[PDB]
Amino acid sequence: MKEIDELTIKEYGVDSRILMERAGISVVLAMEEELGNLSDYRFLVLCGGGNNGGDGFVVARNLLGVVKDVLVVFLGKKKTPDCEYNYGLYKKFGGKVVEQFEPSILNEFDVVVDAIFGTGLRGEITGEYAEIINLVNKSGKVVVSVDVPSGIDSNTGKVLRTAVKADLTVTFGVPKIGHILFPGRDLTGKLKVANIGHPVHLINSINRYVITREMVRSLLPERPRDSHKGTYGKVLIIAGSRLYSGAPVLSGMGSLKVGTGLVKLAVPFPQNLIATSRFPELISVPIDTEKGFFSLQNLQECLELSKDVDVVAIGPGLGNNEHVREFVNEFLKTLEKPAVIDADAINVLDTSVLKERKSPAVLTPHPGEMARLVKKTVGDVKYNYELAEEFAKENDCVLVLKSATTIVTDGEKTLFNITGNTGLSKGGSGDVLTGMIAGFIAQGLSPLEASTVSVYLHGFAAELFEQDERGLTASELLRLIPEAIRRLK
Amino acid sequence: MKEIDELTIKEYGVDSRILMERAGISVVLAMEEELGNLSDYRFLVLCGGGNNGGDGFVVARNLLGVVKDVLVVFLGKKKTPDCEYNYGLYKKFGGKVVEQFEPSILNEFDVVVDAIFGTGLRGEITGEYAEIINLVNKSGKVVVSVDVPSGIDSNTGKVLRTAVKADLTVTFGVPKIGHILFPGRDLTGKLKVANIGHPVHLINSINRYVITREMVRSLLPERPRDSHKGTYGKVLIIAGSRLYSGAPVLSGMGSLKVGTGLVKLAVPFPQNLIATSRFPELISVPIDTEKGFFSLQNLQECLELSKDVDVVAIGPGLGNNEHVREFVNEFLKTLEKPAVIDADAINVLDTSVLKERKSPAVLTPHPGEMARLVKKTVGDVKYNYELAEEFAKENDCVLVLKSATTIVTDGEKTLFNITGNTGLSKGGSGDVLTGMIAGFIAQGLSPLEASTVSVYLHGFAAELFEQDERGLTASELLRLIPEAIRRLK
């Protein structure tokens, strides 16, 4: 957006002062929307010396004479041209500015407007900026952040030593990555994205997107009335082991609940019988194994089973020994169908196999699995969307990096999912998502589309759980999937 | 407001382009408030070459890419600097401008945005401007006027040959006189007044006001619990004649219904008995007359009656012969109490008498009575607020010039009342208002305050009538007064 401001000014000819005025008045309108009538409140506006502080001066000036009290604390050492202009107007309109932050000043205000740093923050916040931000966070006042809560890196969502915790953040043009990834997402509080007059062409030129209800609605496949099961695709799920007998059941039903026509599981005998005892609409094929895990002896049978389906999901509950590794990699090298690759299939995956596949693939790792897959630490891969993009591009796949905010990327387009809650932090949740993705692929969606729709719906289903989210289990999540679809429509 | 724009730019330092941007975005927000989501509508924006057309370009540019279609028809021959700037931005953002108005163009649009002329209109509109405005008025489209409907003189409300009839008018800073007086009030449709960043000091420097609910609430007198009738004042009403026996009854009850403690009427016998037969809480003193009208023989008795009251109302139903003229003028010359002077007392009034009175007066003429009082035509006095101000100042009185919009002035402050409906265009309505004014004066309000509160409440009571307004009578209006007071609170 740094470039979006610049082009809007330099190429389109919009005066910088117009953009800044529209930014500030958007903050005022957003506050009124959340607080109701502003006239009874006393506002403390904390302004830096940059253009964020300039926006702050616009806010402060526009409250003059309309609210109970306004005071600006100016915290910088110099002012950008637009910040100087708007500081000048604020004073001309009768506004009061002080240049020293006094801890007890918080006592006489109701709302703190945080206009210290925006997207121009570079490096750790220290010194008096940090003390001030810490005092605001202990104050219990209503906090409104201009653009991004000060102290959040707008490109990553990381906290730069300390950061403002906002009740309301008003940002301009588009959401920033730091509003979307944690910890930034948490500090942002309620986010409003204000149109401040950038041309819509520049706003739509962005390559990274938040997944919205309207996007998912447009991607849901059509259900022609004169259809039959084959119209809606066929999925094979290769899953399970003597150790992990439940995984296949959750994945299979995941495919059925999103509207797939036929789902077949291949599961080691007698663990295959667990599936049909719970959901008799599944086909659960018994696979004869030596010790309860897939091995190369099952290669030919799984390839045979794959011939009559549209997509294959592999991984959930397979186990991770050497015989599983041999099977997984030889199967994926030979399989000429789209594959959705999860869990233990990721843990044993030879990424050379992905490069050589002619057919597409979706991988669905959590950060632990992604760490192992690229031989990095969890902290280096977590919310690392640039790494995810590089991986997807190099390996010709779609990568779905699961976390509270899920990243979906094919290396050219990256989408962020923010639906869901902590009920999904529990075994079995990922197994469901794997089946949803395979099911949407079988229904005709591209691997990226299927992933986009599935992460959104899987999170939205969790949110529809009636009781406390901590009690949500994967079996309840399945029941909620058709409600999420209905509501989406 | 021409001077308000100038001072805000030249003294306070707000760039003219900022004011113009805020003006245009206010129009967009106002349209959304009235139309809901704008994205399905097609907009035709009619722009003049002045700053009103400049505002229009801002509107048009801000709809680009968000609504179904936008087209600007540019109708001028040159452009002010700010209009040129915003025309330039509109084109840079991809907007289409045509310079010829084609009658059939109206067919492909849903909303017409009228930004042809604002407060800079001088003189009759002719030529192609007039044809265009006439086509818009026959089109049946939704019309939104920027600032003032084009063709209305913003200082008077008169139509300058022809004018746009708007569904919605968005004006900036303060309402204009042309939104408030007819015919302009009618052409304005729904009015919204947008804050575009003028300092509140300049906005409050205005000397002419619309009477609002909040102003009237602040002026209503207090009712101390430990009170008695005398706390709430005493009114004498000198009214009626053998010809007009009902007037005194309506005036008296007008005083009682607004909370006055004691009301006495002086009415020629036996017409005085009509009052108590309808409302026995009135005191209706019989005055012995020779032929059914007040004359000089009743001077001393009325002066005696006046000694024990706080305010005297005179005029309703007196009749207008020479003996009434002698009585009225000698009574007012001698009376050392506030007087409310209405109807036949205005028709015979010697204005020299008003100049010489030490006590205050309120006059309540309709335009016919005002015409006769200053020896001018009805069309010269109607909505002539400058004449009303001059009269009030010269004669040291408050003038209440009744019409659909009522003007209340003491020569320094002028207030406009817009409550009421056509049910008040009926005999007896004015008689009620006269009693309300005297009653509020007796309760301790200044003549200007009492007039302000009374015109507002009298109109608001009319609006509370349950059935069709054309059926409203003065007797029903009385019953509604206490409801209007309750609702005001």
């Binding site: 005022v28 309108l29 009124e32 109701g36 009538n37 502003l38 006239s39 526009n62 309309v66 | 206010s26 927000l29 106002a30 408030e33 309402p175 919204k192 007044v193 947008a194 804050n195």
Partner: peptide, 7 residues
């Protein structure tokens, strides 16, 4: 309710 518009 009224920072931007008077009714």
């Amino acid at each position: 309710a009224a920072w931007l518009f008077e009714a």
